[PDB]
Design a protein around this ligand. Structure first.
Ligand SMILES: [Mn+2]
Ligand SMILES: [Mn+2]
Lengths: 77, 241
């Protein structure tokens, strides 16, 4: 079970542009990833859900696959 | 789920160059994207469907992948392709006219009211529309009315126990032929074809074709009925090419 900040316990479809930016910042610290630029995912949650794993990898060569799977686990819960 | 403007509910292949520009403007707001230049995709829908995901990324480094996937989702959860079918069968009119009966109609066979005379008359709708159209609508407002009617026909079919199990078994092309009839004579009218609807469900194409051709509907509008029947019989667009 993965426990994220309170403001993000909302379904990813309702996440604002700023929410995904906070998610990125949280994931970076929680998972000891390489620094993620704040402008890597300039989009809201609805747009975040449209993206394939390949898109995550392209936007984040170091952590994309991890980020995508993290999202699938959040959706799964 | 994605809820796009009514006129863009038509399959992308019908999209004009202005349509893709409008899709872009909508997508930018719906998905909180970085501003999208209006000149990013200077082309119509047919051309947009030829581009690769790499092309989208190249043209929109910030949103290209999102736009491409958006497009894939729009294509995935079409929609029988019935726009040109009904364009041919009903016609496209931008200004109020009278049908074969005498009732005021506009767009693609959209009934406004059964009220007569020329004393305004109707004047609505005119929102629906609208806005004060004063009798004249755009291509897009005609597409809006058309999609609202298709949705009314589909929900009419899905709320009918004689039509729903038939529509469910039918393939994408034949579904359009069923909606075509519902568009022309209404839910209750098509539901009256009890025996013929049972034939289509059991895939008896030739038998259903012969049975439908003996109808009052066929006698009243032979040319159109023939085309709809041919669609039911072959499962192609041979009659509309
Ligand atoms: Mn008509
Ligand atoms: Mn249009």
């Amino acid at each position: 079970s993965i426990r994220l900040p309170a403001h993000l316990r909302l379904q990813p479809i309702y996440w604002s542009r700023d929410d995904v930016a906070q998610w990125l910042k949280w994931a970076e610290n929680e998972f000891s990833l390489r620094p993620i630029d704040s402008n890597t995912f300039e989009m809201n949650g609805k747009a975040l859900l449209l993206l394939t794993k390949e898109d995550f990898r392209y936007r984040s060569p170091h952590s994309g696959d991890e980020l995508y799977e993290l999202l699938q686990h959040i959706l799964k819960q | 789920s994605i809820r796009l403007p009514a006129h863009l509910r038509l399959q992308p292949i019908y999209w004009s160059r202005d349509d893709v520009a409008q899709w872009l403007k909508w997508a930018e707001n719906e998905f909180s994207l970085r501003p999208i230049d209006s000149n990013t995709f200077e082309m119509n829908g047919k051309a947009l469907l030829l581009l690769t995901k790499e092309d989208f990324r190249y043209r929109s480094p910030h949103s290209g992948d999102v736009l491409y996937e958006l497009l894939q989702h729009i294509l995935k959860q079409a929609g029988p392709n019935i726009f040109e079918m009904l364009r041919i069968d009903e016609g496209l009119r931008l200004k109020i006219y009278k049908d074969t009966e005498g009732y005021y109609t506009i767009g693609i066979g959209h009934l406004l009211t059964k009220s007569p005379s020329l004393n305004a008359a109707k004047s609505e709708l005119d929102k629906a529309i609208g806005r004060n159209t004063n009798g004249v609508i755009t291509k897009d407002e005609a597409e809006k009315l058309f999609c609202q009617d298709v949705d009314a026909a589909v929900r009419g079919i899905l709320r009918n126990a004689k039509l729903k199990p038939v529509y469910d078994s039918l393939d994408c092309v034949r579904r359009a032929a069923l909606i075509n009839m519902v568009f022309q004579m209404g839910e209750t009218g098509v539901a009256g074809f009890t025996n013929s609807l049972r034939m289509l469900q059991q895939k008896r194409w030739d038998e259903a074709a012969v049975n439908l051709a003996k109808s009052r509907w066929y006698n009243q509008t032979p040319n159109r009925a023939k085309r709809v029947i041919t669609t039911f019989r072959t499962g192609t667009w041979d009659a509309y090419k």
